[PDB]
Amino acid sequence: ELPEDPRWELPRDRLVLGKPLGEQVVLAEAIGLDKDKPNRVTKVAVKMLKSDATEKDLSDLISEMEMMKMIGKHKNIINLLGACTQDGPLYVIVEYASKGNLREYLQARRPPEEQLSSKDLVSCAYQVARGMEYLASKKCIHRDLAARNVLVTEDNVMKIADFGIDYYKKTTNGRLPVKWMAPEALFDRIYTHQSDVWSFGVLLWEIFTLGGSPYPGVPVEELFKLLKEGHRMDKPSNCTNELYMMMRDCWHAVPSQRPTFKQLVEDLDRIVALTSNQE
Amino acid sequence: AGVSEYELPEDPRWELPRDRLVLGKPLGEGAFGQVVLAEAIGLDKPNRVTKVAVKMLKSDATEKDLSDLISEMEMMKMIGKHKNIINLLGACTQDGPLYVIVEYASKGNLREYLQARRPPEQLSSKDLVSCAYQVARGMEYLASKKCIHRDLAARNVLVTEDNVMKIADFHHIDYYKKTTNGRLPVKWMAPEALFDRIYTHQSDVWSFGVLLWEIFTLGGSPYPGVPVEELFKLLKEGHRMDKPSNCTNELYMMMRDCWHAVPSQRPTFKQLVEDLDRIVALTSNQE
Ligand SMILES: COc1ccc(CCc2cc(Nc3ccnc(NCc4cc(C)no4)n3)[nH]n2)cc1OC
Numbered sequence: 001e002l003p004e005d006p007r008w009e010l011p012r013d014r015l016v017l018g019k020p021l022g023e024q025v026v027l028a029e030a031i032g033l034d035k036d037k038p039n040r041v042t043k044v045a046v047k048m049l050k051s052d053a054t055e056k057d058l059s060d061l062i063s064e065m066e067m068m069k070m071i072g073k074h075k076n077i078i079n080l081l082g083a084c085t086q087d088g089p090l091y092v093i094v095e096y097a098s099k100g101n102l103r104e105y106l107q108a109r110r111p112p113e114e115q116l117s118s119k120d121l122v123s124c125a126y127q128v129a130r131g132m133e134y135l136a137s138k139k140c141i142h143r144d145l146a147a148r149n150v151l152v153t154e155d156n157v158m159k160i161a162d163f164g165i166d167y168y169k170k171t172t173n174g175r176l177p178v179k180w181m182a183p184e185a186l187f188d189r190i191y192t193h194q195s196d197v198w199s200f201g202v203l204l205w206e207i208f209t210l211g212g213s214p215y216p217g218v219p220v221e222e223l224f225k226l227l228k229e230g231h232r233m234d235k236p237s238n239c240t241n242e243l244y245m246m247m248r249d250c251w252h253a254v255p256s257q258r259p260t261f262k263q264l265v266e267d268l269d270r271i272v273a274l275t276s277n278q279e
Numbered sequence: 280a281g282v283s284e285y286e287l288p289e290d291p292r293w294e295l296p297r298d299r300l301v302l303g304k305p306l307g308e309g310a311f312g313q314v315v316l317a318e319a320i321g322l323d324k325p326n327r328v329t330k331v332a333v334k335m336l337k338s339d340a341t342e343k344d345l346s347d348l349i350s351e352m353e354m355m356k357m358i359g360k361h362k363n364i365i366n367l368l369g370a371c372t373q374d375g376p377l378y379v380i381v382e383y384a385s386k387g388n389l390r391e392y393l394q395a396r397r398p399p400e401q402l403s404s405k406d407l408v409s410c411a412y413q414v415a416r417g418m419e420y421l422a423s424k425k426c427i428h429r430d431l432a433a434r435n436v437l438v439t440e441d442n443v444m445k446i447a448d449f450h451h452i453d454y455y456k457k458t459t460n461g462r463l464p465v466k467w468m469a470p471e472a473l474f475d476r477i478y479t480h481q482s483d484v485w486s487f488g489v490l491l492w493e494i495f496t497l498g499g500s501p502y503p504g505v506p507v508e509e510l511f512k513l514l515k516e517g518h519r520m521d522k523p524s525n526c527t528n529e530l531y532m533m534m535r536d537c538w539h540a541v542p543s544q545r546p547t548f549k550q551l552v553e554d555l556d557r558i559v560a561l562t563s564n565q566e
């Protein structure tokens with residue numbers, strides 16, 4: 001049996017499980033998630049263990065939930081809304097983002113859903129930096145910050161997910177997560193907020209290429225050689241010299257010299273206000 | 280070889296006496312040939328010196344390497360003169376090693392020329408389109424003379440003192456073989472040339488598109504860190520190199536057109552020369 005936390009506990013008859021969202025996370029409807037409004041349904045995402053899970057997988061899911069409780073609420077992160085911990089499988093209830101991951105969102109909006117202006121792209125970057133600055137302020141290190149791990153809501157709000165290793169392992173889309181990793185995290189296994197800033201630099205590149213794949217055709221061994229040579233990704237087209245300078249600053253060889261998330265948030269705030277929405 | 284082991288046939292139209300050629304510093308070398316800087320005393324008519332490039336065999340060459348050098352010289356005679364190609368000026372074929380005398384381009388290859396001029400002799404957007412126009416004009420002439428290049432890349436384009444673009448070097452090939460700079464020549468090859476060994480003027484158009492990419496990236500390296508096997512996989516997926524920064528949508532559409540999967544759907548060198556001529560005239564010299 002699991003211990004019961006009344007702040008977060010939702011009765012099981014208040015949760016209507018729906019279609020799976022991805023491979024497990026399912027779409028669901030929560031009845032009266034808020035105690036003050038018991039007659040309203042909220043579309044939510046529910047994370048649960050599969051039938052083949054072990055006692056280690058359960059402790060991992062519990063730890064993720066406990067971590068989300070400690071971190072607290074922020075507009076630019078996927079927030080915890082509740083849990084079903086008693087008399088049945090553990091359900092971790094989180095915010096639902098209907099427009100999917102940021103990579104897919106940007107790809108679907110490439111020129112021939114709707115079209116994104118230059119100001120909208122800088123706004124995505126600002127929102128992600130904002131969420132990262134909050135997570136860093138809570139002493140949290142992400143370790144896999146990428147566009148695939150950023151979710152977009154119905155109201156186009158950016159929300160960071162999975163915040164709370166074999167180099168040759170590939171993702172579902174067939175990409176290599178090492179391509180987002182700072183050299184000190186890759187070669188010395190040193191993970192800091194500065195190593196996440198390097199990953200944010202790769203994320204900025206993904207935004208301004210509208211869901212572009214980093215280093216296409218490059219295997220792990222060749223990437224290690226590019227990083228050792230001090231190779232850096234090329235300036236995307238439809239990217240200012242100022243935004244490319246930001247990416248390059250995030251990719252400083254010396255971690256202490258990279259900008260912080262606080263600086264990135266301030267710079268991005270000023271750039272948004274100066275960026276045209278007319279193209 | 281056809282008596283060439285002991286003596287070469289004469290061609291008085293092109294023959295320069297050996298005492299009228301002063302061999303100088305080497306410019307570069309391959310597996311069995313080499314290129315040296317030289318001074319030629321009175322090429323035309325009479326006593327003035329011209330700085331020239333001389334191609335000759337290395338001391339380890341075979342009869343096959345000699346027949347290859349002879350064939351290159353004979354091909355250059357057939358092709359004729361054009362401003363945007365390295366032209367034949369003469370030869371020393373009798374009583375000694377074969378010397379193939381060609382035009383000297385002092386500012387080196389286009390890849391180095393563009394890299395040395397990256398911002399910190401700056402080049403404007405009109406200068407870049409002008410390089411592209413000049414290469415297309417040289418290629419249009421070579422194609423009109425039934426010459427298929429097979430290795431059209433910025434490394435094989437030479438730049439003279441007056442900034443004129445001149446094309447040089449106009450189962451046997453190993454895909455895994457690298458250049459001096461450490462690049463893979465397969466990254467310039469058309470898919471039909473790569474997968475079906477079909478070489479045409481349309482396959483050279485594909486290479487010109489990769490050359491256009493090299494110009495607008497100011498000597499940028501195509502597909503860095505990509506091995507041969509992965510490149511084959513990118514081409515099979517219909518992957519295309521990204522639009523460089525400081526490159527118009529019109530010039531990127533030109534590159535993409537050059538990279539059409541169907542060779543008949545690619546522009547011809549005649550069409551590229553016409554398009555580039557119109558673009559140059561409309562391109563600013565102010566940036
Ligand atoms: C306990 O740890 C987690 C905390 C939060 C999440 C995100 C839950 C979620 C998913 C969605 N919206 C969509 C829309 C379209 N497609 C998907 N696919 C599923 C998917 C993508 C990612 C990123 N994570 O799950 N989701 N909103 N909210 C997943 C977590 O575990 C992997």
Ligand SMILES: COc1ccc(CCc2cc(Nc3ccnc(NCc4cc(C)no4)n3)[nH]n2)cc1OC
Nearest residue numbers: 306307314332351365382383384387434435447448
């Ligand atoms: C019959 O085949 C050829 C016909 C012409 C040539 C080019 C001759 C030449 C070289 C130069 N100027 C410089 C300047 C700086 N560095 C060099 N490097 C030498 C080099 C580069 C390439 C391309 N070919 O040779 N050359 N001007 N003119 C080469 C040929 O075969 C390899």
